[PDB]
Write an enzyme that holds these catalytic residues in place. Sequence first.
Site, short mmCIF file in Angstrom:
data_model
loop_
_atom_site.label_atom_id
_atom_site.label_comp_id
_atom_site.label_asym_id
_atom_site.label_seq_id
_atom_site.Cartn_x
_atom_site.Cartn_y
_atom_site.Cartn_z
N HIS B 101 0.83 -1.20 0.00
CA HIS B 101 0.00 0.00 0.00
C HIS B 101 0.87 1.25 0.00
CE1 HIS B 101 -4.19 -1.38 0.36
NE2 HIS B 101 -3.69 -2.42 1.00
N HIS B 187 3.42 -12.60 -2.42
CA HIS B 187 2.60 -11.67 -3.18
C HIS B 187 3.32 -11.32 -4.47
CE1 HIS B 187 0.63 -7.79 -4.19
NE2 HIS B 187 -0.42 -8.35 -3.62
N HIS B 223 -2.63 -12.12 -5.25
CA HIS B 223 -2.54 -11.08 -6.28
C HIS B 223 -3.12 -11.48 -7.65
CE1 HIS B 223 -1.15 -7.73 -8.76
NE2 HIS B 223 -0.51 -8.61 -9.50
C1 LIG Z 1 -3.88 -3.45 9.38
C2 LIG Z 1 -5.38 -3.77 9.43
C3 LIG Z 1 -6.04 -2.71 10.31
C4 LIG Z 1 -5.94 -3.82 7.98
N1 LIG Z 1 -5.75 -2.61 7.11
C5 LIG Z 1 -6.06 -1.29 7.20
O1 LIG Z 1 -6.63 -0.79 8.16
C6 LIG Z 1 -5.71 -0.54 6.15
C7 LIG Z 1 -5.97 0.78 6.14
C8 LIG Z 1 -5.63 1.67 5.11
C9 LIG Z 1 -4.98 1.34 3.92
C10 LIG Z 1 -4.69 2.30 2.96
C11 LIG Z 1 -5.05 3.63 3.19
O2 LIG Z 1 -4.77 4.58 2.26
C12 LIG Z 1 -5.69 3.98 4.37
C13 LIG Z 1 -5.98 3.00 5.31
S1 LIG Z 1 -4.98 -1.55 5.04
C14 LIG Z 1 -5.14 -2.89 5.94
S2 LIG Z 1 -4.60 -4.45 5.46
MN LIG Z 2 -1.76 -8.35 -5.00
MN LIG Z 3 -5.83 -8.55 -6.94
#
Ligand SMILES: CC(C)CN1C(=O)/C(=C/c2ccc(O)cc2)SC1=S
Ligand SMILES: [Mn+2]
Ligand SMILES: [Mn+2]
Lengths: 321, 331
Positions: B101, B187, B223
């Site tokens: 991310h 992944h 993925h």
């Molecule tokens: C770590 C856990 C709480 C699961 N989780 C999120 O809360 C996430 C939050 C998130 C991801 C991208 C973003 O731009 C904002 C929040 S991603 C993910 S896996």
């Molecule tokens: Mn992926």
């Molecule tokens: Mn995918």
Amino acid sequence: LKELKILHTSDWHLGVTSWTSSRPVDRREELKKALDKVVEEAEKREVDLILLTGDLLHSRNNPSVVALHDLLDYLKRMMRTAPVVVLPGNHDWKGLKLFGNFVTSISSDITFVMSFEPVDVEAKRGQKVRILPFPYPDESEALRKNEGDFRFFLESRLNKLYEEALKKEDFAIFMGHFTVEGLAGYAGIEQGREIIINRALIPSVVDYAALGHIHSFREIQKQPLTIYPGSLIRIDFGEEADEKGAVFVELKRGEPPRYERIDASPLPLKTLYYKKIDTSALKSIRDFCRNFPGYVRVVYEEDSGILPDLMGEIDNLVKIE
Amino acid sequence: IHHHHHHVINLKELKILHTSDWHLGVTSWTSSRPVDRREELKKALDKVVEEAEKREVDLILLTGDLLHSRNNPSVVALHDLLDYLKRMMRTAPVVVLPGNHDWKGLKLFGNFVTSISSDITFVMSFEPVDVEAKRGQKVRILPFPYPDESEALRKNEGDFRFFLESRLNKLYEEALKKEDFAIFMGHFTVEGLAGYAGIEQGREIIINRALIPSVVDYAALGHIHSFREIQKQPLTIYPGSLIRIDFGEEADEKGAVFVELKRGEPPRYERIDASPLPLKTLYYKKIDTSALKSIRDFCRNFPGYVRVVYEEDSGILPDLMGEIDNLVKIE
Ligand SMILES: CC(C)CN1C(=O)/C(=C/c2ccc(O)cc2)SC1=S
Ligand SMILES: [Mn+2]
Ligand SMILES: [Mn+2]
Ligand SMILES: CC(C)CN1C(=O)/C(=C/c2ccc(O)cc2)SC1=S
Ligand SMILES: [Mn+2]
Ligand SMILES: [Mn+2]
């Protein structure tokens, strides 16, 4: 049981850099050291419940990675000592509530109250504690605000908490994030700004009212015991005379509540006052700063023409007014 | 009575559920006829959760893109993610290998959540972690997340390949130090994708299946939208997504995977069908009298979504999209 030991700390302001206009000073090292002392005293006094209010993070809507990392870290350190109840400030990131609820759901050592709804938590020695939260009003409130019904809106919720507080089992604790009406001294305002609530509107049937959002320690009232613990460091020179730390509160089912201040002993601040900046004063400033283990402000009245680079030759001098 | 992990003596069995690429928050065909897939997606997710509780799995593995938006997930998508995350944790301990991310706070929250709970673990580095399964089985996770800079600016050539290989060899040596079971989580895109579809594509990490540590009891990959049984030794599976995201997945079968492990015997697995809505592409040279009759007849009682593909215009096209709620795309 019939006894509840509480540690209450607030307004950590993690991530803060002071005097960015004149001389930026990262308060991280000082803050962490003060934050460590509070944690040690939590373990030493063996508290049953830990209360967190105010601005734990300095940046409301853009905290750095390091600041967030410090927050989560110290949250965890708190959790290993005693169960933690947190009343977060106002953040516009709507995902924060989702996180708070999620973390609350998966751990029995931490609770995030992010609504006006009361929550029954369990203290370290099994004491049942009813939390009466009063966070910064959503909108909701700022949408239906007409000054008249807005005050009535606040009273309604405060009356609702009073009714819910009567349903308590062992203890009942009020947590609020607002400014008490009648503060002329810090009072960092406003203008603005945050919600103003009167003392008497706080549910008297609670055993303790945990407040935040204020930098300086304030004992609002005795019945019910209402306290702003204040920050752990001296953020600016308005807090120069303040003593910084947390609050240790002990409760008994019949006896009146008592409390003690837990000194964090952060770095000292000093303001030096001069009529004008001349040769004698210039040496006086340089001499004091070299022997002062804290940060120094210098204010002077009369214009002294061209001033030598003092905020470039004195690492201790952070501000000149 | 209690709601914690069991502890069985001499237990050499491990039941696993593996699901991937949920893509929560996705809206399909936003350029022709936007369709919110939330209701369909939640329906499939409930089916997977119930299959976990029914089989009483010992461990749950999550890979791929659980969120559709990598850098800006909506509040609703995030809420569904956390909700279903909580639902899995009630059933069995959960191990999550998140796709890369853009946000940098995810690492902090993942580590925080992992530190405060013994029923969910976030693997966001190459470091192996030992986790405890529902019945007390010791499970060593060998995570292979998306690499980091590295990829930007990928400098250079085969040096990056030697980096990937070195990491895989490290995981192999750590897999040898397993106590009971060992599970690989990756992944990336396996070399020799045969064949649907290659896109994606897009700037990907390609790794040969032989480079995956053979001493692991199971290789959990993600993925890829389509289910794939990459190999049987070690058992390597892309579960695929739970819904048909676009018309390239028309012939796909969507679901999760139930895996059962035993010390002496080889791993067996069953596919858990999510049974999502079907897709269909309709091909025509030009949309004429015959084509209109064909489109209308088919879409009439088709329970899924339909795409019409044609080559040349021939007169003004009738309002087929307004007439047919099934028709989501006439390109
Ligand atoms: C770590 C856990 C709480 C699961 N989780 C999120 O809360 C996430 C939050 C998130 C991801 C991208 C973003 O731009 C904002 C929040 S991603 C993910 S896996
Ligand atoms: Mn992926
Ligand atoms: Mn995918
Ligand atoms: C989720 C809590 C365990 C800790 N916590 C945060 O992580 C917060 C993160 C935050 C707050 C505001 C913002 O603009 C971005 C992140 S606030 C808070 S209390
Ligand atoms: Mn505040
Ligand atoms: Mn504050």
